[PDB]
């Protein structure tokens, strides 16, 4: 029961016959998930976590790269993946649903494998991921460091349908989200107007909302979405909302989180992304690895 590093393995609901690329790679590189798991539980116990220095993230990343690599050289839709600890090791599961992802957690558990986590590669918005119980959750290695990305966990999901391209969000549900977000942000930022602006520059995946459906790459315009200023009170202005998406050569998913970046009297944030290690950090903030 001492924190260490070791080579994890993955389990999948993979089906041999399914030619779906994930199932093809999964079956080969993965083993059946254990049906009857299997949690121990602790309380009054406190452990130091750190979603920002977590070897588990690196392992998942390497597998997904290799996943896409083998894949590309048609069926495509990600599967919930599980990551398990070798005999001699276990995985601490922090149960404090208020955890900022860094520091001490006074309420932890013990499992061998992680929950089903779909490897969905995207930018600006995390999709099909898990939700935050209760309040909006806010995470960053260093807020004082505007250069470090900010991960915002959603406690209520928003549906999305990009198809052809164009995508759609419910205005009513979006503005609801952002006010509560500027609120949480206002908690971390005092006498400062919290503005939201589209990605200021850089690669096309990073400046638009990017993601892949059925094997097609969708790069969608985000200018309308990140166009709101929120002082004490709050109000988002933009042209339901529609975002123009480009294609390459229909899918309905749930938005569950955000990636923000602050600019160095006001504090404006923009959408980030790129390093998919955050998409992972988004789902592996709760896990940690110890040898017994």
């Amino acid at each position: 029961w001492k924190e260490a590093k070791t080579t994890l393995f993955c389990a999948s609901d993979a089906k041999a016959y399914e030619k779906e690329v994930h199932n093809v790679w999964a079956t080969h590189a993965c083993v059946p998930t254990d049906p009857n798991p299997q949690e121990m539980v602790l309380a009054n116990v406190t452990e130091n976590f750190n979603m920002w220095k977590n070897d588990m993230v690196e392992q998942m990343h390497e597998d997904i790269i290799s996943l896409w690599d083998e894949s590309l050289k048609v069926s495509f839709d990600p599967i919930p993946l599980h990551y398990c600890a070798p005999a001699g090791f276990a995985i601490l599961k922090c149960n404090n649903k208020t955890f900022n992802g860094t520091g001490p957690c006074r309420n932890v558990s013990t499992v061998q494998c992680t929950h089903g986590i779909k490897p969905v590669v995207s930018t600006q918005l995390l999709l099909n991921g898990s939700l935050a119980e209760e309040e909006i959750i806010i995470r960053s290695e260093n807020l004082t460091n505007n250069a470090k990305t900010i991960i915002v966990h959603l406690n209520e999901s928003v549906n999305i349908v990009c198809t052809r391209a164009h995508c759609n969000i419910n205005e009513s549900k979006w503005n609801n989200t952002l006010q509560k977000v500027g609120e949480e942000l206002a908690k971390h930022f005092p006498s400062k107007t919290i503005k939201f602006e589209p990605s200021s520059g850089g690669d096309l995946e990073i400046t638009t909302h990017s993601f892949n459906c059925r094997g097609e790459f969708f790069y969608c315009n985000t200018s309308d979405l990140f166009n709101g200023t929120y002082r004490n009170g709050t109000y988002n202005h933009t042209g339901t909302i529609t975002l123009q998406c480009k294609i390459k050569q229909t899918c309905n998913s749930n938005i569950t989180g955000l990636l923000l970046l602050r600019d160095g009297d006001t504090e404006t944030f923009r959408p980030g992304g790129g390093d998919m290690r955050d998409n992972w950090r988004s789902e592996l903030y709760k896990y940690k690895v110890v040898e017994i």
Partner: nanobody
Amino acid sequence: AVQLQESGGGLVQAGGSLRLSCTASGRISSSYDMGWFRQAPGKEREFVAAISWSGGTTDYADSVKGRFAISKDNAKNAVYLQMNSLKPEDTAVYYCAAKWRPLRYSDYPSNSDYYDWGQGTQVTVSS
């Protein structure tokens, strides 16, 4: 992920030339960018060159266009940096670096935000 190790750094008279080599111990997928950044003393980390791993498109920092040249060898999992007509300003630690861009729209390499790094190699230019 991929393991980066730069070499060939050194000390050279102004106007001189020098070649740096980065080698990835892991393996680079098709959707990768490989580039060079450098940090001069007292200053911050800037960009120098980038090459698409698959298509081999390049991009150079303006202060570099014409003098440096970035090349790859997929067989050896290696990227190289030929630096000619060196100036005292080119003095810095050079870092090989990489970036997994599976959602890249084009073969054009990036000039920003890399995710995987090397430990750096020393480059010093004497006036």
